[PDB]
């Protein structure tokens, strides 16, 4: 009759219940939301309250309670949950809800070794006083539950043993800003810091995990993925392997080109025993790839590339096929099959495809990427030469075999090597593109290493970022954003550290960036377009011309200010060539949208002053950054309106943006009747993109007689892709609801 319920606090222990405090907090968090029952939430969490429960559990319980009500019909639960979590996380890091003054926080963190000490060296207390005025901690209320789960799980500075969280999202953004523009002239430094801070805190620009979690801390490792090219020599094999080990140790995704390794049977090159062929080395690269992962299999991802005509291609194509002898299988690495025009033509004309070890056909491999004419010449020549070891395969058999394995595993990727060189930012004669990265989006020059510290080797890297098409109002807001994205990444290039000499060489040499989009699907839904009917062709054309034009303008503006990248002379940009001049001709037949920008002015401006960065755009997928912004992933249509994630804290649900008004506007992934629509859109985007796009093919068995996808359909989509200039093809997804 004084039946209380004693709450226990952070070693301050005992104290009576405060169910009216709780309601106030809840009531607050609900402010502005529609369709959320505070009573419902209280009911569901009060029932699990027990006498001496700690306050921290009261928060967890009320948070989950709110999170478990997330649905398509009551989507504001994601914010009610998020805000509760945000509130909890403030108290958790600061003791109050109100964040400490920025200077105080930075000071405290520097003494604790959690932030880089250079922050205080580079900025004055007065400069921190001023940044604090830019900060808006109320923006923490705009995150969705899954986004807070992500920030909390892998972005905010915390102690992973104790569990202690040390910062709040707004300090993250403001300090990312400050670190990246720390070297700017006092005159403009803080105007940039603010502009960027705004951009990222209001989700206009997304930033990769390594950057968001690291910049502001003592680390200098920000690599997402590297591209290494192996020469046909034990020295190079070794070096490649060494490089892979250093890089997976830093969590980077690996793209390996092992296409020049001579085939099994070929002669010992005085000491180098390649009698045994490619597989044994591939296996060796896989162990290297997995050297810093959990059991010897969990974590550490890579994609290995080889030409379709390599002599061991049929053995190579079935490396992930589980039914087979252990010795002839490298199942934990994806493969990238490299194809060009002539291969396809052999398929079309029902003719044969000749396999050759690269060691035996002088000039063929280089020609394959750089000059199709020459490739054809050397190819036909070597087919007739009976001295040359070769094998014949019916092109149909080879293609089907590849598509089959692609179909079953989903991880046998295609790379159109002519497309990558005839429509690229680089001169193929000097710096050709002969491979991609792990998720087939990056396309950059690489040179084999002869030792791990070889200074004449070149490794390409992933320097990324993205525009949120959902958070811009008009495409003319991209000019400001391009500036900020390009400037911040270019600074990162000089800020971060390089574990391997050949990877510094490429970054400093070409200053290559890969900026892409996220929220494409939601963007199309707001404009009432769809993916499969071709209704989004002109809008896509309009949107990617704007993205590429402003990225080049920002990079051009930057070369003016601080000088073009050292190797700008190796780009097609340097010779007055633009993406609008080399795109695949057939696109003209599926989109009439006219360029709205002065490309001719820019052409001269580039020829004259050059480009800071040699490449600027690349469309990567991005589950994590998209989640932070409550955005659909990269350019992909969503699988359904509500996506589900597992956690230790319960089931995390996230509802597609503005489901309330756009449920009928969205075209879910399995609603598309086939792939033509989408591939057309990818081809259009590819007109303007410097690198490549992680494009998927998707098939639903329900749509086919006897539930089996015809090899015909698979080849037809493959050729459709090539016909509209698609550079790469990533995953293949199969099913009808996930």
């Amino acid at each position: 009759m004084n039946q209380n319920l004693l709450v226990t606090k952070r070693d301050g222990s005992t104290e009576r219940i405060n169910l009216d405090k709780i309601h106030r907090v809840l009531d607050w968090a609900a402010e502005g939301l529609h369709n959320v029952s505070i009573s419902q939430v209280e009911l569901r969490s009060h029932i699990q309250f027990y006498d001496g429960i700690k306050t921290s559990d009261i928060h967890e319980t009320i948070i989950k309670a709110a999170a478990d009500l997330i649905s398509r019909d009551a989507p504001d639960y994601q914010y009610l949950a998020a805000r509760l979590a945000i509130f909890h996380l403030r108290k958790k890091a600061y003791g109050q809800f109100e964040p400490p003054a920025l200077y105080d926080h930075v000071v405290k963190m520097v003494e604790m070794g959690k932030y880089d000490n250079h922050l205080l060296e580079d900025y004055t207390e007065e400069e921190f006083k001023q940044m604090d005025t830019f900060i808006d901690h109320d923006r923490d209320m705009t995150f969705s539950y899954a986004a807070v789960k992500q920030l909390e799980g892998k972005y905010l500075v915390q102690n992973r043993v104790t569990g202690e969280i040390y910062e709040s999202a707004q300090f993250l953004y403001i300090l990312v800003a400050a670190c990246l523009f720390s070297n700017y002239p006092r005159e403009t430094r803080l105007q940039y810091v603010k502009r960027f801070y705004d951009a990222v805190s209001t989700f206009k620009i997304s930033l990769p995990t390594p950057i968001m979690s690291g910049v502001r801390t003592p680390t200098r490792q920000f690599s997402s993925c590297v591209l290494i090219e192996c020469g046909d020599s034990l020295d190079s094999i070794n070096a490649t392997s060494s490089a892979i080990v250093k890089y997976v140790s830093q969590r980077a995704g690996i793209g390996i080109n092992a296409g020049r390794i001579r085939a099994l049977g070929s002669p010992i090159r005085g000491g180098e025993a390649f009698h045994t062929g490619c597989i044994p080395f591939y296996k060796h690269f896989q162990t290297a790839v997995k050297s810093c992962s959990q059991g010897g299999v969990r974590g550490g991802a890579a994609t290995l590339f080889y030409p379709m005509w390599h002599l061991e291609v049929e053995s190579l194509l079935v490396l992930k096929n589980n039914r087979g002898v252990e010795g002839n299988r490298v199942r934990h690495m994806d493969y990238g099959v490299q194809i060009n025009k002539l291969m396809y033509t052999r398929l079309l004309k029902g003719e044969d495809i000749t396999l050759f070890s690269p060691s035996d056909v002088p000039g063929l491999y280089d020609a394959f990427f750089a000059d199709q004419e020459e490739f054809e010449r050397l190819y036909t020549k070597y087919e007739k030469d009976d001295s040359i070891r070769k094998q014949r395969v019916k092109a149909v058999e080879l293609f089907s075999l590849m598509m089959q394995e692609r179909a079953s595993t989903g991880r046998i990727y295609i790379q159109n090597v002519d497309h990558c060189n005839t429509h690229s930012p680089f001169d193929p004669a000097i710096a050709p593109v002969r491979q991609s990265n792990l998720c087939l989006a990056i396309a950059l020059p690489t040179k084999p290493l002869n030792d791990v510290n070889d200074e004449n080797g070149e490794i390409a890297l992933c320097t990324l970022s993205a525009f949120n098409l959902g958070a811009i109002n008009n495409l003319d807001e991209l000019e400001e954003l391009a500036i900020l994205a390009v400037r911040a990444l270019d600074a990162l290039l000089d800020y971060q550290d390089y574990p391997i000499p050949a990877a510094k060489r490429g970054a400093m040499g070409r200053r290559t960036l890969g900026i892409g989009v996220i929220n494409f699907a939601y963007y199309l839904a707001k404009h009432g377009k769809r993916y499969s009917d071709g209704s989004a062709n002109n809008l896509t054309h309009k949107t990617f011309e704007a993205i590429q034009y402003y990225l080049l303008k920002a990079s051009n503006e930057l070369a003016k200010e601080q000088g073009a990248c050292p190797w700008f002379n190796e780009t097609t940009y340097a010779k007055g060539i633009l993406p609008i001049d080399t795109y695949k001709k057939d696109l003209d037949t599926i989109a009439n949208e006219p360029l709205h920008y002065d490309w001719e002015a820019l052409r001269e401006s580039i020829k004259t002053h050059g480009l800071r960065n040699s490449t600027l755009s690349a469309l990567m997928p991005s589950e994590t950054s998209s989640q932070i912004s409550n955005a659909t992933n990269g350019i992909e249509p969503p699988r359904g309106y509500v996506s589900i994630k597992a956690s230790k804290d319960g089931i995390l649900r996230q509802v597609v943006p503005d489901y309330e008004h756009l449920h009928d506007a969205y075209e879910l992934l399995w609603e598309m009747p086939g792939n033509d629509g989408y591939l057309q859109l990818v081809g259009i985007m590819q007109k303007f993109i410097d690198q490549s796009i992680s494009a998927n093919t998707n098939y639903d068995p329900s749509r086919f007689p006897s539930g089996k996808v015809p090899m015909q359909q698979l080849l037809k989509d493959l050729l459709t892709a090539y016909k509209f200039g698609v550079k790469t093809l990533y995953y293949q997804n199969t099913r009808d609801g996930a």
């Binding site: 079309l348 029902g350 179909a407 079953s408 989903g410 089996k708 996808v709 015909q712 037809k716 016909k723």
Partner: peptide
């Protein structure tokens, strides 16, 4: 995962333009 029908028609493809 992927269950396919490996029947291919070159005649159909023939007439495609890359």
């Amino acid at each position: 995962v992927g269950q396919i029908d490996s029947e291919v028609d070159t005649d159909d493809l023939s007439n495609f333009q890359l």
